[PDB]
Amino acid sequence: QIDRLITGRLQSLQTYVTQQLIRAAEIRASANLAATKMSECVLGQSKRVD
Amino acid sequence: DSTECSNLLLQYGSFCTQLNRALTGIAVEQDKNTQEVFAQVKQIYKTPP
Numbered sequence: 001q002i003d004r005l006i007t008g009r010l011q012s013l014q015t016y017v018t019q020q021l022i023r024a025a026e027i028r029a030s031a032n033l034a035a036t037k038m039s040e041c042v043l044g045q046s047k048r049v050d
Numbered sequence: 051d052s053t054e055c056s057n058l059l060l061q062y063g064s065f066c067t068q069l070n071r072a073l074t075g076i077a078v079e080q081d082k083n084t085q086e087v088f089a090q091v092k093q094i095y096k097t098p099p
Contacts, residue, residue, distance in 0.1 A: 012063065050090070 040046040059066075 008062065015065075015068070 040048070
């Protein structure tokens with residue numbers, strides 16, 4: 001029973017870590033886009049449409 | 051179409067709800083991307099004859 005509980009909790013923790021990694025990749029992409037915007041629109045005049 | 055299987059599965063936790071939420075988020079972001087790519091102008095223009 002202890003082994004079953006350990007396996008279940010470890011699987012839950014690994015699923016949480018995978019979801020956190022995916023969300024971190026998404027947030028990193030969004031942050032790179034935000035940094036590009038900060039460098040272009042703020043520190044200059046970007047002629048890029050929309 | 052099983053009864054005891056569901057009774058034993060309900061003891062694992064919120065895996066069902068988590069997978070359903072992930073699939074729903076995927077389905078929503080698909081339409082979000084489809085709207086962001088094509089729907090950029092809120093006015094349907096028509097070419098003259």
